[PDB]
Design a protein around this ligand. Structure first.
Ligand code: GNP
Ligand code: 6L8
Ligand code: MG
Lengths: 208, 1011, 123
């Protein structure tokens, strides 16, 4: 039960950071431009079963665009991403959209305005209307704060599975094993643990 | 494995190997996929891959492989077409044409290869942009002709025309020069009569839906630009509004066509056109009622059910109705025979407005705001819409979104986590419409609200959702009623809401109802001001909630307190009748009791609200006494902590002491924020010891880095010591930015400040420098810089070079220093430019470097200040006129700024700054074309004008940077650009025309004569 | 769900990290409710933690008695400890974990409860 999801938008808007948060739970602060595309599978557990997305995280910087619209072939859904701290990225949303629906003419598409965590917002809420005429779903999101991070995938999953009441459910939790530590490498986990103890956790001013 | 073989072009291409790489990319996974991807990218990027295109299209069995071949041609056509020899051009044309014809005659390919035929049409369209009509003038005639040969070719011709209209009218601004865009637009316009014929015949004929839907999709595009006559002087509106509304195959595209038709503004004097605008609306609404849904249908349930394309049809319908009615409802409001039409349409909108779908609601709420604003001003309209407005009151009141202020929520009623900002704009838009609807009929709004309320008292309708949405609505209409009706309204509402918290017991009930009363009372300050006995009771009740164990209620009680005080402060400073003292006196006396269970942040808000009150007292002597009373606790704790720091300066080790100091300083910051200039006596009380404590904590931090390494700046202890330093800086900044007595700022504050902060900043290691030092200095320079020229010099010397070295190795480290640094250079450059003149020549050169380094950031905060500094700096040098410093400035730096500006304009990585980059460049060029540079810019024959040398420098500069341009392109560009250096808008157009030409070969040099 | 055969001894909101010893950085793994669950049938106590809105497991492992909570150099509200058999991602991998809480009180109460559990598992 798997669906091809293409992710598009200008460079720097936070596409790869958004996926990676869903893959691993981490927040990558560095900007390493995506080269062509990166494919990751991503599974959600719903009350209607598991749904699997094959996420084609494509590249926003033109000089890294690779096959460009060639990535869109046979996509079943998509996310268009812009950055609400960068007006230029909203203004290009119509260009990504044009190129996406020339290849994929009838697929569910979400428009996501990322980085609403940043105090100085530039793309005002009232100004975000492109999606109305094109029947896109729209959400404010932040990959850094997780604000609404799940809503694009919950929406798409409802549209793909055909069930507006589909919800995410807790995966069942198998008993964990009773493993005793290895005395051969017990003198070794002094070091691995020393490093981690003296590396400071990121973002110590956060509420958590 | 051996997938990389296709990258070797020595041999011929193994098509079957190509196809295996492709299917490994699309259909594979993991590493083989990731490796096939890199192979295909390298294959595509090869400047000769296009030659392999026709053999991939001839002999391949993979549609994806052919797609990728076409992407390779597209790249070649868009960027390098005119460098091809003419024979390859026609070969490529005839190949692409022939593959299209060939695919549209094979009924099986036509059905199953839609993606590949679309890609081919787009490729053909790329060839038209380059070749049509000047080297292909019969394209449109042949296309019309060939449309009779087949139904598959006619259908596909529509796709080509749709993609052509898009590329010419909808997406040409950014991708073509002005001149080329005009040329293709005029060419399409000239040949549209014929195109319309084909499209109108197809639509009347009526083959099958597949051709129809494509002809309509093309029509959607034409309507963005074609003349009104093609719509109103034919029978095409009757077709759209009737025939194609009935079939659901065509109904979606037709509605979108009718929305575009709507949106135009009609010639507002012709009775015929007006009647036609009415008729197509009347036809459309009859087909909806009869063939889709009657006006009573439950569109909320239909949309929730999400069968088929319902959700999209309802959205398109909402967009059609709102679009047409905002433009044209006046066509329906006077003729009595049009009244049911007007109202049925608005009745559909009432039903659309009950769907649960935020974004769809926002779309309809925008229309309702347009309506009710019109009805508040236009004479004789509102009675027409009375029953609509009555229904809208109920819709809005039952779907109020939670306001910012209401900090409780359900998951179990608990506290918020996050500032819902997708909700902030909605609430405001709901409030605005509801406030208008209350003006339009205040009696009906009250009756709705009081009855809904009567039916909560009864438990007849009780629930979290219902009492809340009602309460938020009741709050949101503050200021629409008369003071007298308000009086009786609020009384009733409060009486009823009090009854409700006594009935609904349990910890979750009482938190819901308490948040609702706080919201409501906080929203009616006019009432509170007039009913002092009630105001006093409200405040005492809020003080009570400050001891509540439910953290949501408690945090809300603090915010409600200061929200009330911002509006009613005057009533807390005067002595009220029947009161032994101003109420401020009672609040201050009891502050330790009132605030004892609050978190520190909430304590500081409480003190901030007391400062708002104290600043209402304008007798200086009485204000300063209130201020010292308010500050008694933090000042006794301060006087204690400072005798115990001076005697044996080591107690500050103590993590508890550190927290205590920071909260003292944060308390002063809170009170200073609301008292402003009036805070000065309190600041003077602590200033000298505070600056000594600053030096003392600075020593502690230094000594901990020294003993533990850089990692010490991550420890709780050192972050706490730095918090002390940051808060001291914030307090000083906060005071200085509101001070009215600048003479005291300079004579009392500034010198001890600079002695305390600047060397400590300069001689710390980089990871221990606080960027707040920079922010503090920026306010100092902003507010009194003009009075402290030697102080500004001193600031530069201490922070300029050492900060630059922190931030000039990449664009990412020390982000906050970066931003604060360019903010400080900006203010110094506009207010104390003399500081830069006394800079040594080496350091002035680092300053120019610093400005240019900012241009290259993508971080907009930095970039924009960089461009502004550069512009202001030019103005500053120009103002010196003809003197040595300015002439040596031009000799040394003029061409550095021209070329760096040109770099960021053309590298495609700094688009956000185009407008300011163009501004800077036009200023620079204009300096030379007004002989405001009184010195030769060169080291070339003597007597040469600076204008001639500038042209020469720039032609050489662009020739080496863009060697694929011809000399004539460059020369025409510079001629246009220099001629337009007093006309920013045209200058910008000319730069945009250049940015287009540098992306292709063979740009036409006459394009720069466009203006 | 596979949890109704268990009793909740302790719940707290936390943020969980996993140390990438190759990159030498901590990497967040999830943010949600951290629970101590005591198996009604075996009396074995585990940590189970789920992400807030996807509800995805981000920690599932026995609160072994061999484990020891250490402080992290940057925080007075966090604990580092090494885990040999965590199944949140599937195969029982080994991790160095850090878990941070809203406050230092939350962190200290967690350490108390974590240690009590170790005694219970000591049987
Ligand atoms: N403050 C904030 N920053 C974010 C957020 N999401 C992503 N970022 C930041 O945006 C920057 C770009 O990261 P990235 O996810 O790779 O963006 P991208 O669109 O995938 N880049 P590309 O298209 O070139 O491959 C990073 O620095 C990242 O920390 C967010 O939600 N909030
Ligand atoms: C009900 C009840 C009570 N008799 O005060 C109560 C409920 N919770 C906690 N403590 C007491 N109740 C609920 N809310 C109020 C209330 C709230 C305000 C305030 F929101 F603070 F403005 C004001 C008033 C008053 F001014 F007294 F009407 C009452 N009472
Ligand atoms: Mg990316």
């Amino acid at each position: 039960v798997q669906f091809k999801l293409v992710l598009v938008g200008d460079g720097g808007t936070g596409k790869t950071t958004f996926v990676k948060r869903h893959l691993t739970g981490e927040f990558e602060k560095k900007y390493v431009a995506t080269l062509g595309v990166e494919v990751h599978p991503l599974v959600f557990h719903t009350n209607r079963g598991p749904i699997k997305f094959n996420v084609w995280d494509t590249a926003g910087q033109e000089k890294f665009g690779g096959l460009r619209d060639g990535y869109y072939i046979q996509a079943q859904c998509a996310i268009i991403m812009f950055d609400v701290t960068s007006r230029v990225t909203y203004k290009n949303v119509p260009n990504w959209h044009r190129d996406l629906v020339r290849v994929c003419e009838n697929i569910p598409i979400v428009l996501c305005g990322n980085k609403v965590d940043i105090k100085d917002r530039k793309v005002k809420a009232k100004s975000i209307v492109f999606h109305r005429k094109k029947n896109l779903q729209y959400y404010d999101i932040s990959a850094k704060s997780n604000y609404n991070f799940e809503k694009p995938f919950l929406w798409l999953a409802r549209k793909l599975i055909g069930d507006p009441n589909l919800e995410f459910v807790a995966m069942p939790a198998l008993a964990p094993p009773e493993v005793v530590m290895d005395p051969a490498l017990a003198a070794q986990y002094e070091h691995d643990l020393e490093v981690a103890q003296t590396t400071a956790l990121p973002d110590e001013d956060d509420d958590l | 494995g051996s997938m990389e073989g296709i990258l070797d072009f020595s041999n011929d291409l193994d098509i079957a190997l190509l196809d295996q790489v492709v299917s490994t990319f699309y259909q594979g996974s993991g590493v083989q996929q990731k490796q096939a991807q890199e192979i295909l990218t390298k294959f595509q990027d090869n400047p000769d891959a296009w030659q392999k295109a026709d053999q991939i299209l001839q002999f391949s069995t993979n549609p994806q492989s052919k797609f990728i071949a076409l992407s390779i041609l597209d790249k070649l056509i868009t960027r390098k077409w005119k460098l091809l020899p003419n024979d390859h051009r026609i070969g490529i044309r005839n190949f692409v044409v022939g593959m299209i014809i060939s695919m549209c005659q094979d009924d099986e390919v036509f059905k199953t290869q839609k993606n590949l035929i679309n890609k081919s049409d787009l490729t053909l369209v790329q060839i038209l942009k380059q070749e049509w009509p000047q080297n292909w003038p019969e394209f449109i005639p042949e296309l019309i002709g060939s449309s009779s040969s087949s139904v598959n070719v006619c259908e596909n011709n529509m796709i080509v025309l749709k993609l052509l209209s898009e590329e010419v009218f909808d997406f040409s601004a950014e991708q073509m020069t002005q001149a080329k865009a005009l040329h293709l637009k005029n060419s399409m316009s000239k040949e549209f009569e014929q195109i319309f014929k084909l499209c109108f015949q197809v639509l009347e004929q009526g083959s099958s839906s597949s051709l129809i839907v494509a002809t309509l999709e093309s029509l959607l595009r034409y309507l963005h630009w074609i003349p009104y006559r093609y719509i109103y002087e034919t029978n095409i509106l009757e077709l759209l509004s009737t025939k194609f509304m009935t079939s659901p195959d065509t109904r979606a595209i037709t509605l979108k066509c009718l929305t575009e038709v709507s949106n135009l503004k009609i010639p507002q004097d012709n009775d015929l056109i007006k009647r036609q605008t009415v008729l197509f609306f009347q036809n459309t609404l009859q087909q909806i009622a009869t063939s889709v849904m009657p006006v009573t249908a439950d569109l909320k349930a239909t949309y929730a059910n999400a069968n088929g394309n319902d959700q999209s049809f309802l959205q398109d319908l909402a967009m059609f109705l709102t679009t047409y009615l905002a433009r044209n409802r006046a066509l329906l409001e006077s003729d009595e025979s049009l009244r049911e039409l007007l109202l049925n349409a608005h009745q559909y909108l009432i039903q659309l407005s009950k769907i649960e779908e935020r974004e769809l609601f926002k779309t309809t709420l925008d229309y309702w705001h347009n309506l009710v604003a019109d009805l508040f001003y236009e004479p004789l309209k509102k009675h027409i819409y009375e029953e609509i407005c009555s229904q809208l009151r109920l819709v809005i009141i039952e779907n109020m979104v939670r306001p910012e202020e209401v900090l409780v929520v359900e998951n179990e009623i608990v506290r918020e986590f996050v500032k819902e900002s997708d909700t902030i704009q909605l609430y405001k838009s709901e409030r605005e419409v509801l406030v208008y609807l209350t003006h339009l009929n205040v009696i009906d709004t009250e009756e709705i609200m009081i009855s809904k309320l009567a039916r909560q008292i009864d438990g007849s309708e009780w629930s979290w959702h219902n009492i809340n949405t009602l309460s938020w609505a009741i709050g949101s209409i503050s200021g629409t009623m008369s003071e007298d009706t308000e009086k009786r309204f609020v009384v009733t509402v409060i009486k009823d809401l009090l009854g409700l918290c006594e009935q609904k017991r349990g910890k979750d009930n009482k938190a819901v109802v308490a948040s609702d009363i706080m919201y409501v009372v906080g929203q009616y300050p006019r009432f509170l001001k007039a009913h002092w006995n009630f105001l006093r009771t409200v405040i005492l009740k809020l003080f009570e909630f400050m001891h509540e164990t439910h953290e949501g209620v408690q945090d809300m009680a603090c915010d409600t307190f200061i929200k009330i005080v911002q509006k009613c402060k005057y009533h807390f400073v005067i002595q009220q009748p029947r009161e032994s003292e101003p109420f401020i006196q009672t609040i201050i006396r009891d502050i330790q009791k009132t605030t004892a269970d609050l978190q520190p942040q909430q304590v500081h808000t409480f003190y901030k609200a007391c400062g708002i009150i104290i600043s209402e007292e304008r007798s200086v002597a009485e204000r300063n006494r209130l201020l010292s009373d308010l500050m008694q606790l933090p000042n006794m704790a301060w006087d204690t902590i400072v005798e115990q720091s001076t005697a044996n300066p080591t107690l500050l080790l103590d993590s508890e002491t550190v927290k205590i100091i920071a909260n003292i300083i944060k308390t002063n910051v809170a009170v200073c924020t609301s008292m402003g200039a009036d805070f000065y006596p309190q600041l003077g009380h602590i200033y000298y010891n505070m600056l000594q404590l600053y030096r003392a904590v600075s020593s502690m931090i230094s000594a901990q880095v020294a003993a533990e390494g850089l990692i010490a700046t991550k420890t709780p202890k050192v972050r706490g010591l730095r918090t002390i330093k940051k808060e001291i800086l914030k307090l000083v900044e906060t005071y200085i930015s509101k001070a009215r007595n600048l003479d005291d700022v300079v004579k009392v504050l500034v010198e001890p400040l600079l002695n305390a902060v600047l060397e400590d900043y300069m001689n710390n290691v980089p990871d221990a420098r606080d960027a707040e030092v920079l922010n503090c200095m920026t306010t100092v320079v902003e507010k009194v810089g003009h009075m402290i020229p030697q102080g500004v010099i001193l600031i530069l010397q201490s922070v300029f070079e050492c900060t630059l070295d922190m931030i000039n190795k990449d664009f990412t480290e020390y982000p906050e220093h970066r931003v604060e640094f360019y903010k400080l250079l900006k203010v110094i450059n506009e207010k104390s430019f003399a500081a830069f003149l006394e800079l040594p020549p080496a350091a002035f050169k680092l300053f120019v470097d610093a400005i240019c380094w900012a241009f290259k950031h993508n971080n907009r905060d930095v970039e924009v200040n960089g461009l502004q500094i550069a512009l202001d700096l030019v103005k500053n040098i120009e103002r010196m006129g003809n003197v040595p410093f300015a002439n040596e400035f031009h000799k040394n730096y003029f061409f550095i700024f021209v070329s760096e500006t040109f770099f960021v304009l053309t590298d495609s990585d700094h688009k956000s700054g185009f407008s300011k980059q163009a501004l800077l460049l036009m200023k620079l060029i204009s300096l030379v074309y007004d002989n405001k540079i009184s010195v030769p810019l060169y080291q070339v024959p003597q007597g040469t004008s600076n204008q001639v040398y500038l042209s020469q420098y720039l032609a050489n500069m662009l020739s080496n940077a863009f060697p694929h341009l011809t000399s004539e392109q460059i020369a025409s560009f510079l001629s246009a650009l220099t001629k337009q250096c007093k006309d920013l808008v045209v200058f910008k157009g000319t730069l945009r025309d250049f940015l287009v030409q540098i992306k292709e070969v063979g740009g036409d040099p006459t394009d720069y004569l466009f203006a | 769900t596979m949890e109704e055969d268990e009793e909740v001894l302790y719940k707290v909101r936390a943020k969980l990290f996993r140390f990438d010893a190759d990159a030498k950085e901590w990497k967040e793994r999830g943010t949600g409710d951290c629970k101590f669950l005591k198996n009604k049938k075996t009396n074995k106590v585990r940590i189970l933690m789920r992400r807030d809105k996807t509800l995805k497991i981000c920690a599932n492992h026995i609160i072994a008695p061999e484990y020891t909570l250490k402080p992290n150099v940057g925080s007075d509200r966090s604990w580092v400890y090494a885990c040999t058999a965590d199944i949140a991602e599937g195969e029982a991998e080994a991790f160095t974990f850090a878990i941070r809480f809203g406050s230092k009180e939350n962190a200290d109460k967690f350490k108390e409860e974590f240690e009590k559990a170790q005694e219970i598992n000591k049987k």
